[PDB]
RNA sequence: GGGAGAAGGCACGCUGAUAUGUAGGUGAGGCGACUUGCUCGUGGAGCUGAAAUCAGUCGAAGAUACCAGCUGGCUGCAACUGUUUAUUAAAAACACAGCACUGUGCAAACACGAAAGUGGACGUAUACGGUGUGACGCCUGCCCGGUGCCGGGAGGUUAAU
RNA sequence: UAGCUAGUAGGUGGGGUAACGGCUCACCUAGGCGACGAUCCCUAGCUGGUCUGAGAGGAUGACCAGCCACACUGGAACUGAGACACGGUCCAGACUCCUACGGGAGGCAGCAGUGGGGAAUAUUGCACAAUGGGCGCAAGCCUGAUGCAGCCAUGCCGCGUGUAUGAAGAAGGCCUUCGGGUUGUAAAGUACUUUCAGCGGGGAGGAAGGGAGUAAAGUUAAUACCUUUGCUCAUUGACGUUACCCGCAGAAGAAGCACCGGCUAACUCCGUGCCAGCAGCCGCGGUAAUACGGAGGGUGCAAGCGUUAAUCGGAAUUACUGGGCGUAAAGCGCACGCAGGCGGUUUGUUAAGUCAGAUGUGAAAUCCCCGGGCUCAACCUGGGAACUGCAUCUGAUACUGGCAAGCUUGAGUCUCGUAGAGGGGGGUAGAAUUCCAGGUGUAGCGGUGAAAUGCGUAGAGAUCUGGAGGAAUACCGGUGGCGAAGGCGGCCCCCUGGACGAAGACUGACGCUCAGGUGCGAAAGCGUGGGGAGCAAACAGGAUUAGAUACCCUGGUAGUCCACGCCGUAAACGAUGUCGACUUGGAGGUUGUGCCCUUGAGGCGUGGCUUCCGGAGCUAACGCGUUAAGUCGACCGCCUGGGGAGUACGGCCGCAAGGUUAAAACUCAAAUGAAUUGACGGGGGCCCGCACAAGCGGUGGAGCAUGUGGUUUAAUUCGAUGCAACGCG
RNA sequence: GUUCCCGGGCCUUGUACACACCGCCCGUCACACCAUGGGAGUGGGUUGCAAAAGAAGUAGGUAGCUUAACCUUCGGGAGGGCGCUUACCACUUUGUGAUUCAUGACUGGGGUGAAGUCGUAACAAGGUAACCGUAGGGGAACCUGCGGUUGGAUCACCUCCU
RNA sequence: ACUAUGCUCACG
């Protein structure tokens, strides 16, 4: 029962995605900012709120370029049943480079291309093509 | 599927049986010979064609093909035994050697004759 | 539950020591105390006393005599303990628990008896008598022409009167 | 193979060992091990590496190198620094030996070799010259360790077998469009070179030294002996008639063997006729074979070529990278649940995981780049990275875990209700069936496609009267409800489980899944004891039929009912595991609860559960589609071609019936799913024609004419043979 | 006159058919071969447990015999060496199991084989829809009961209503 | 109403 909750971000975004829907409302964590914040940052989602203060609800805001959707693809990698630990130099590079690793490294969650450069790896969370 | 059932029961290799057990990974076997003997195929050929059950060496009784017209295989007579199935006779599933022992080559064979074991004319 | 004492093994005498005879067993005078005693605890004086162990030691042999299972394998029949031809047959025969059929509504059927009357039973259909079968397990197929039995009552036949 | 273990597990007293210690005693404690697979069983030297693979992997452990083990089999210890000793000692064994018969030997899994085994692997070779090692002050012994070469197409690699010109486009073969093409610049030839073996002359390079007598410089009392650096000497080569460099002759000595229907580079003629044979897969042959045998012609490799066996690959056909489970193989019948896997949300702290750097180390070899020596390569070799390693201190703390104290959204409690064939136990009602006795009453009843068996003149059937008993509950009743599933329907009480709604209050992650375990689990069965109307396996009789151990009819016992135990399965089915989140709609059914005028069977929301149609999306398609087969997460179960087979064998479970677990040999090249076009149906609808009905005259009977079959014959020429051959050619 | 009979046409549906219902196809029975289970047993291989056995060796214990070096007072002491003995233990012997591999009269099924016998169980409403579980029956496919599934067909047949 | 069967192989 809702044992991962990042997936479960993750598929909210697809799935608004596949409905050209506008805004994507869930329960707010930590992890949950930390991830979205990356991925407005690079530029898949467009603005991001945290609403609410005892049953905070973070709502994202998808972006959309044509009639298609920006998100191409977005896929869970370190699942809780299975756990991924990447080193510096074995970190992947998702569609040779031009989609993103969301990678939760020791100085806070950031892309693989960020972790390269600063020098470290961890655990990483999903892929963004 | 499941990782977690991987774990706890690995993936099990079809370990696939061999065609011919002749045994130890064995090129060729000699075999004693009893009953030469003629044998109807399966349902589109229709022939009389030519068998032998082989006394192996190391215990087993087999059958072999005599390929070839006309041999020189009787009641005992020693020969040599090599894989490949007829694909016609059911059961059958070797190959005498032609040439080697007392199977002797096919009399006036020209073209093809390592198989069959003949010499140049 | 058995089979099973399956089979097959090994150890045993005597003498010291552990312990100048021990685990135990029975426990005297003694110490207090309760009530009033053929007292309670309390302690152990003797007395009795295995079984072990370790070492020695004699003989051909130590359960040394008497005493006191032969054992195992396949199989027929009968489940079993039991009973039987006193005196040539102890069995596979009889009985057996269990099984079914069947009769019997109690003044029961049935049994002994000219009868009265007893038993069945001071019981009452989860009871009683008869008959077959014979623990238990898996089962118990078809035939009602014959002979018996049960029921049916029209017609035919039919005694005494 | 699920339990194993008594020096077994510890502790101490003693004891031994190079040394820690049940290594060994004596006692003391009575444990230790095992689902993270003990024990037992089968198989096996291990690694560096090798092989294949894009890589992960899979396979593997010949050859070189490290470690272990073993030495005729089974023990034992001695001698030493080191062994329980490969050509040591000692017993015992088996099997060869020599014996004067008392007693003695013997150990190639060191090198050659024999027999034997086998599909199959080598000479009773040559030398210590080098390179190690043993010995020794060294002069050198011994070294089948190294070095070589015998043999071996067994490999990886090199060069061979000639090279220019050649028209009559020879012949002969070979196809013939008997005109000609083709083999074919092929040959014969006409010019030139001579690699390579085969003869012969030269002749590197593996060789550092060793040794003598020496000079000096050390050494010392010493210009002696000894030692060192200059220093003069003679020599050492198994391989060896070396490697290699020149001369002899003259194309001279030197090419197969697969294949040729598709896959897969490459065509014809004969011979043969489902025969003879090919076959890696499909498949080739029945008198015009591209597949068979031959020939030519080609094609592909060539000192090798095919076949064979063996591993990986392709095979995403065990899927970690990287598959699936509605219908193809595959969701346990359904629940509960311990171990296990996974776990909402927020701060603090450890750092186990994770990450970052640190030093160690991954033996050398191969493998990989920049080089170099073989005449070239193969080989050889120098360095480089590589050696994706594994450990060790230091930090980073996001994530995951550990430990905090929370929080409240998941989850649970209470509060008031709502609906319901949820359950279990007990009653009672009405209709009907059968039967029982009773009245009426007069020939049938019953049944069937049609009959008969059956039942009836003993008075049936029909009709009514009164009983008795059993089982099941018409109508309501629905794509209605409840239950985890199985399943659960008259009405009434008794005890009782859950579901849902309303708004609060409380708990504060208590959760989700679940291998083993355990419960429930239709019908049929099974056991003991009741009951027994109807129905009805078996069974009987009458029909049906070629037969009818069936279907139909008349009878009819177990059983169906009950109480209590067992069984443990079904197409136990939405052929769809459970939990949770998320993503267009419409029409309804059903049960709630709000807002409003109940102002009149309404107005408008919003929770459960449910049926039907459809969007995106998915799917092989069919279809699924907010109750997903969509998009994701957690965990479980299961699948790996069809037959053999959910069978055998053993285990467990059952009274049995049997269930459950669960193979292998062998065999086939398919089996399978969905959908497509036909054809067919004793499927449906609509039509048609001398198709049938409604007629009319015929053939079939006779004789004769004709035509076939047959039979006969010297020949009865040949062809036509359901309709569409038979007064037919 | 269209019900049936023979053929044909069109639409629709089911199909395991496709020289395309003169289709496909099931099981027994007969024959041949192959692998395979059971089987009175027989014969090897390995191995557990319970014992006996005790060679050499090593260690302990020593009445007996015996002796180079130490101490000796030149008596003999110590110490050893044989021999003996006790423990450990190899070959070997006995019993009884386990397991595994051969083999066995006969027997149960299974597979395979161009043209054998008996039927027609299934595929169409396959002519009694099929199948699943289960029980009984039957030469054979199978048939029948009870419950279950649709992976069944037709619904212009009635005659009257949605 | 009920109502069986079709010997083997052959369209690159
Ligand atoms: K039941
Ligand atoms: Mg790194
Ligand atoms: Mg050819
Ligand atoms: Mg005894
Ligand atoms: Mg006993
Ligand atoms: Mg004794
Ligand atoms: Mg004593
Ligand atoms: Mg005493
Ligand atoms: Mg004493
Ligand atoms: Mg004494
Ligand atoms: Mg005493
Ligand atoms: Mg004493
Ligand atoms: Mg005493
Ligand atoms: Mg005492
Ligand atoms: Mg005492
Ligand atoms: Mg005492
Ligand atoms: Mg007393
Ligand atoms: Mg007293
Ligand atoms: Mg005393
Ligand atoms: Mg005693
Ligand atoms: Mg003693
Ligand atoms: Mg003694
Ligand atoms: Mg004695
Ligand atoms: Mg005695
Ligand atoms: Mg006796
Ligand atoms: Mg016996
Ligand atoms: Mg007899
Ligand atoms: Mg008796
Ligand atoms: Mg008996
Ligand atoms: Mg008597
Ligand atoms: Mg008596
Ligand atoms: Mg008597
Ligand atoms: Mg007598
Ligand atoms: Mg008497
Ligand atoms: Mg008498
Ligand atoms: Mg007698
Ligand atoms: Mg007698
Ligand atoms: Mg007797
Ligand atoms: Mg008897
Ligand atoms: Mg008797
Ligand atoms: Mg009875
Ligand atoms: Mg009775
Ligand atoms: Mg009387
Ligand atoms: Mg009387
Ligand atoms: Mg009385
Ligand atoms: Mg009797
Ligand atoms: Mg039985
Ligand atoms: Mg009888
Ligand atoms: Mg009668
Ligand atoms: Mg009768
Ligand atoms: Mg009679
Ligand atoms: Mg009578
Ligand atoms: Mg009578
Ligand atoms: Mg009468
Ligand atoms: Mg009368
Ligand atoms: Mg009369
Ligand atoms: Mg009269
Ligand atoms: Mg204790
Ligand atoms: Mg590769
Ligand atoms: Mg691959
Ligand atoms: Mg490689
Ligand atoms: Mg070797
Ligand atoms: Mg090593
Ligand atoms: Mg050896
Ligand atoms: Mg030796
Ligand atoms: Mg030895
Ligand atoms: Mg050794
Ligand atoms: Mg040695
Ligand atoms: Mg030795
Ligand atoms: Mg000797
Ligand atoms: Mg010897
Ligand atoms: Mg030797
Ligand atoms: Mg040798
Ligand atoms: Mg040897
Ligand atoms: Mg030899
Ligand atoms: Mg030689
Ligand atoms: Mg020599
Ligand atoms: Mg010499
Ligand atoms: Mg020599
Ligand atoms: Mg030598
Ligand atoms: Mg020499
Ligand atoms: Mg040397
Ligand atoms: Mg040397
Ligand atoms: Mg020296
Ligand atoms: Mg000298
Ligand atoms: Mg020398
Ligand atoms: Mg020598
Ligand atoms: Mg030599
Ligand atoms: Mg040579
Ligand atoms: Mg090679
Ligand atoms: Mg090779
Ligand atoms: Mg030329
Ligand atoms: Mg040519
Ligand atoms: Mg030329
Ligand atoms: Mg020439
Ligand atoms: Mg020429
Ligand atoms: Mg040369
Ligand atoms: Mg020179
Ligand atoms: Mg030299
Ligand atoms: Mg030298
Ligand atoms: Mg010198
Ligand atoms: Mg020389
Ligand atoms: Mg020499
Ligand atoms: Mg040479
Ligand atoms: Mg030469
Ligand atoms: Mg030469
Ligand atoms: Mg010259
Ligand atoms: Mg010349
Ligand atoms: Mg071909
Ligand atoms: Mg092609
Ligand atoms: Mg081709
Ligand atoms: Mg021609
Ligand atoms: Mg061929
Ligand atoms: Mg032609
Ligand atoms: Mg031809
Ligand atoms: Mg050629
Ligand atoms: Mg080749
Ligand atoms: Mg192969
Ligand atoms: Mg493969
Ligand atoms: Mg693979
Ligand atoms: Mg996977
Ligand atoms: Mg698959
Ligand atoms: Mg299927
Ligand atoms: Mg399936
Ligand atoms: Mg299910
Ligand atoms: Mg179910
Ligand atoms: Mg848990
Ligand atoms: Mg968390
Ligand atoms: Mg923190
Ligand atoms: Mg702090
Ligand atoms: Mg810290
Ligand atoms: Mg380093
Ligand atoms: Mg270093
Ligand atoms: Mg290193
Ligand atoms: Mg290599
Ligand atoms: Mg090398
Ligand atoms: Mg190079
Ligand atoms: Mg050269
Ligand atoms: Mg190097
Ligand atoms: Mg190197
Ligand atoms: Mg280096
Ligand atoms: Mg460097
Ligand atoms: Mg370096
Ligand atoms: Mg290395
Ligand atoms: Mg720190
Ligand atoms: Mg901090
Ligand atoms: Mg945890
Ligand atoms: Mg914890
Ligand atoms: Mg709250
Ligand atoms: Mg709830
Ligand atoms: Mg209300
Ligand atoms: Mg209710
Ligand atoms: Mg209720
Ligand atoms: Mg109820
Ligand atoms: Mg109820
Ligand atoms: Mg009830
Ligand atoms: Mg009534
Ligand atoms: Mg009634
Ligand atoms: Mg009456
Ligand atoms: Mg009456
Ligand atoms: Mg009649
Ligand atoms: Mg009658
Ligand atoms: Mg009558
Ligand atoms: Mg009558
Ligand atoms: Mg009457
Ligand atoms: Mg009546
Ligand atoms: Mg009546
Ligand atoms: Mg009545
Ligand atoms: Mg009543
Ligand atoms: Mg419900
Ligand atoms: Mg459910
Ligand atoms: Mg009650
Ligand atoms: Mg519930
Ligand atoms: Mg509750
Ligand atoms: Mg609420
Ligand atoms: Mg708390
Ligand atoms: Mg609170
Ligand atoms: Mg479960
Ligand atoms: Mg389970
Ligand atoms: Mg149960
Ligand atoms: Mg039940
Ligand atoms: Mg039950
Ligand atoms: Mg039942
Ligand atoms: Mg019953
Ligand atoms: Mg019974
Ligand atoms: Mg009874
Ligand atoms: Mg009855
Ligand atoms: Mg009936
Ligand atoms: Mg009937
Ligand atoms: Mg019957
Ligand atoms: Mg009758
Ligand atoms: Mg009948
Ligand atoms: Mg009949
Ligand atoms: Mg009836
Ligand atoms: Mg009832
Ligand atoms: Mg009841
Ligand atoms: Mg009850
Ligand atoms: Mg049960
Ligand atoms: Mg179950
Ligand atoms: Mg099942
Ligand atoms: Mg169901
Ligand atoms: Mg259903
Ligand atoms: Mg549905
Ligand atoms: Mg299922
Ligand atoms: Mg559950
Ligand atoms: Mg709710
Ligand atoms: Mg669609
Ligand atoms: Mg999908
Ligand atoms: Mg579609
Ligand atoms: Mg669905
Ligand atoms: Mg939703
Ligand atoms: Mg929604
Ligand atoms: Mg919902
Ligand atoms: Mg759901
Ligand atoms: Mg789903
Ligand atoms: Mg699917
Ligand atoms: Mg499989
Ligand atoms: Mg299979
Ligand atoms: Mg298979
Ligand atoms: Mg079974
Ligand atoms: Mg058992
Ligand atoms: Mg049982
Ligand atoms: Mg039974
Ligand atoms: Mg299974
Ligand atoms: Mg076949
Ligand atoms: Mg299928
Ligand atoms: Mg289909
Ligand atoms: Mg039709
Ligand atoms: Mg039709
Ligand atoms: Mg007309
Ligand atoms: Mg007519
Ligand atoms: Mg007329
Ligand atoms: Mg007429
Ligand atoms: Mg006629
Ligand atoms: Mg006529
Ligand atoms: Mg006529
Ligand atoms: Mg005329
Ligand atoms: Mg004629
Ligand atoms: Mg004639
Ligand atoms: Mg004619
Ligand atoms: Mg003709
Ligand atoms: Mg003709
Ligand atoms: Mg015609
Ligand atoms: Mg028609
Ligand atoms: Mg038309
Ligand atoms: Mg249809
Ligand atoms: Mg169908
Ligand atoms: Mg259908
Ligand atoms: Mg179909
Ligand atoms: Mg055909
Ligand atoms: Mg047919
Ligand atoms: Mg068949
Ligand atoms: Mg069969
Ligand atoms: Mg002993
Ligand atoms: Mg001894
Ligand atoms: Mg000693
Ligand atoms: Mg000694
Ligand atoms: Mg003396
Ligand atoms: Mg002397
Ligand atoms: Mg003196
Ligand atoms: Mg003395
Ligand atoms: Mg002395
Ligand atoms: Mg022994
Ligand atoms: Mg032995
Ligand atoms: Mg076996
Ligand atoms: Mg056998
Ligand atoms: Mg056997
Ligand atoms: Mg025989
Ligand atoms: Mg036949
Ligand atoms: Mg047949
Ligand atoms: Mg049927
Ligand atoms: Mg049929
Ligand atoms: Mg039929
Ligand atoms: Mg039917
Ligand atoms: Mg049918
Ligand atoms: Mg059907
Ligand atoms: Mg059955
Ligand atoms: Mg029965
Ligand atoms: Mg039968
Ligand atoms: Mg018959
Ligand atoms: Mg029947
Ligand atoms: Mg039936
Ligand atoms: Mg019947
Ligand atoms: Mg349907
Ligand atoms: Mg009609
Ligand atoms: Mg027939
Ligand atoms: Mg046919
Ligand atoms: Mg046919």
Do not use: W
Not at chain 1, 92 to 114: E, F, H, N, Y
Not at chain 2, 75 to 98: A, C, M, N, Q
Not at chain 2, 102 to 114: E, H, L, N, T, Y
């Amino acid at each position: 029962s809702m044992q991962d909750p990042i997936a479960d971000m993750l598929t909210r975004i697809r799935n608004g995605q596949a409905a050209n829907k506008a805004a994507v409302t869930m329960p707010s964590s930590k992890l949950k900012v930390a991830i979205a914040n990356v991925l407005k940052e690079e530029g898949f989602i467009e603005d991001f709120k945290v609403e609410g203060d005892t049953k905070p609800e973070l709502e994202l805001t998808l972006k959309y370029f044509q009639g298609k959707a920006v998100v191409e693809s977005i896929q869970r990698v370190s699942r809780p049943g299975l756990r991924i630990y990447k080193r510096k130099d074995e970190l992947p590079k998702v569609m040779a480079g031009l989609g993103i690793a969301v990678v939760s490294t020791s100085k806070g969650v950031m892309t693989d291309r960020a972790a390269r450069q600063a020098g470290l790896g961890g655990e990483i969370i999903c892929y963004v093509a | 599927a499941t990782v977690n059932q991987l774990v706890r029961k690995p993936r099990a290799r079809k370990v696939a049986k061999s065609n011919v057990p002749a045994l130890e990974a064995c090129p060729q076997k000699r075999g004693v010979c009893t009953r030469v003997y003629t044998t109807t195929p399966k349902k589109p050929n229709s022939a009389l064609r030519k068998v032998c059950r082989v006394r192996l060496t190391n215990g087993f009784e087999v059958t072999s093909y005599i390929g070839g017209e006309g041999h020189n295989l009787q009641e005992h007579s020693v020969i040599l035994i090599r894989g490949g199935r007829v694909k016609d006779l059911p059961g059958v599933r070797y190959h005498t050697v032609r040439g080697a022992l007392d199977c002797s080559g096919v009399k006036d064979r020209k073209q093809a004759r390592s198989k069959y074991g003949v010499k140049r004319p």
